[PDB]
């Protein structure tokens, strides 16, 4: 239970039962009243934000949502499994909490928000390598990547050709 | 600590304890040693 006067962007805390992270913090003490802490937050899983204000007293409740680096191993059910390339533990993350679970790859290294040994956000890198196993040798054509997902690519990019794809736009960002 | 953790020792089927501190992760995954019980004298001793 940390108060507010002691916040800093980056500090993660539990508010309204949810997980946030102060991203804006500004001590406010005008007039002779008591001081006030006016911050802005971001949910750890959803992007939702919310600026709020607190008095000098009011305590918050710090959380421990450290971000280790996990690793994909294999699919299973409507879930996919990773591993902390550190302590090699096994995490069965439900497809929802794996941002861009598709456009991923059974063996790629991504990032997760460990909150009590259970990722609530699993992001890959902005762009990853993937072997297109589809597309007609026919310009801006659709191409099924090895991970089953499909992407728009140019011509020259043909079956077997490994390319790059921004995991945020699933757009062809060049070849391997 | 967490990776640390508290723990005691049981005389093997019975009572008494020592209560030391294992250390998770590092040399862990169970652990027993020889130590003297309030009753009778010296035996093994498991965690729990």
């Amino acid at each position: 239970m940390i108060s507010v006067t002691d916040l800093r962007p980056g500090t993660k805390v539990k508010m309204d039962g949810g997980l946030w992270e102060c991203v804006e913090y500004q001590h406010q003490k005008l007039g002779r009243g008591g001081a006030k802490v006016v911050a802005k937050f971001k949910n750890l899983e959803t992007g939702a934000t919310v600026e709020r204000t607190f008095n000098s007293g009011e305590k918050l409740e710090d959380i421990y949502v450290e971000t280790r680096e996990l690793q994909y191993l294999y699919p299973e059910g409507e879930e996919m499994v990773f591993m902390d390339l550190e302590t090699y533990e096994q995490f069965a993350v439900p497809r929802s909490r794996v941002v861009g679970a598709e456009f991923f790859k059974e063996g790629m290294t991504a990032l997760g928000d460990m909150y009590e040994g259970q990722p609530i956000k699993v992001t890959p890198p902005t762009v990853v390598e993937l072997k297109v196993v589809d597309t007609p040798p026919g310009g801006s054509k659709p191409a099924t990547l090895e991970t089953g997902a499909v992407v728009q690519v140019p011509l020259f990019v043909e079956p077997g050709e490994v390319i790059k794809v921004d995991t945020r736009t699933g757009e062809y960002v060049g070849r391997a | 600590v967490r990776i640390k953790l508290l723990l005691e020792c049981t005389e093997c089927k019975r009572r008494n304890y020592a209560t030391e501190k294992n250390k998770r992760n590092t040399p862990n995954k169970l652990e027993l040693r020889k130590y003297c019980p309030w009753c009778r004298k010296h035996t093994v001793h498991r965690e729990v």
């Binding site: 690793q71 191993l73 294999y74 591993m83 302590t87 090699y88 533990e89 096994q90 995490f91 259970q118 | -």
Partner: protein, 224 residues
């Protein structure tokens, strides 16, 4: 048929007391080979609750032997400790090539953290859904590889809940000395009981039995 005169050896209504199903579990199994005594138990949890899955091993007082081929994939003289431990197969990122391409003649697979990286990176999907991959919880990763390898021979077996919410695990051989298996059972229960997911509402072990590799499964009181 043949199990009929074999199934009468079970009181479908009764509740045994381990021991009760011990003298019995031997009269239950009869085959042209030593049957391994299996154990099953419907634990009260939800698979879908990522947290509550149960992954843990246990070193048994009796039963379990080198009836397993363990592979130690490591770097350094770890190999020396491993090989001296009883590491049927030894060799780091060169043996990954064996397994990666065809090879597959073992059961367990221990490894060292230092070379562990490459393992799951290039072996994930293969032995991954096979449960063979090294996992801390299921203690098959690390550096004290010695005891580790040396132990998968004495009596330490894993047991991870399935998706239906049940867990099974061989507690020993059928021609086992009476009070050994019966004792070897409590060892298995006391460890699985000792692993209750903090938020598991209701009663845990809901249905626990004592079967034989081939046939009859006498349900018992897991507090006997």
């Amino acid at each position: 048929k043949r199990y009929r005169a074999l199934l009468e050896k079970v009181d479908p209504n009764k509740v045994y007391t381990i021991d009760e199903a011990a003298r019995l579990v031997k009269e239950l199994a009869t085959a042209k080979f030593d049957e391994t005594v299996e154990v099953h138990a419907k634990l009260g949890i939800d698979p879908r609750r990522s947290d509550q899955n149960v992954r843990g091993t246990v070193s048994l007082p009796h039963g379990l032997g080198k009836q397993v081929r363990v592979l130690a994939i490591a770097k350094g003289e770890k190999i020396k400790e491993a090989e001296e431990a009883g590491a049927d197969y030894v060799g780091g990122e060169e043996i990954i090539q064996k397994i990666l391409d065809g090879w597959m003649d073992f059961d367990a697979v221990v490894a060292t953290p230092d070379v562990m990286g490459a393992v799951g990176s290039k072996l994930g999907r293969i032995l991954g859904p096979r449960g063979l991959l090294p996992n801390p919880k299921a203690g098959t990763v690390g550096f004290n590889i010695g005891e580790i390898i040396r132990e998968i021979k004495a009596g330490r077996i894993e047991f991870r809940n399935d998706k239906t919410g049940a867990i099974h695990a061989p507690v020993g051989k059928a021609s086992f000395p009476p009070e050994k298996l019966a004792d070897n059972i409590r060892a298995f229960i006391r460890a699985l009981e000792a692993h209750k997911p903090e938020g598991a509402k209701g009663t845990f072990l809901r249905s626990v039995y004592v079967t034989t590799t081939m046939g009859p499964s006498v349900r018992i009181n897991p507090h006997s």
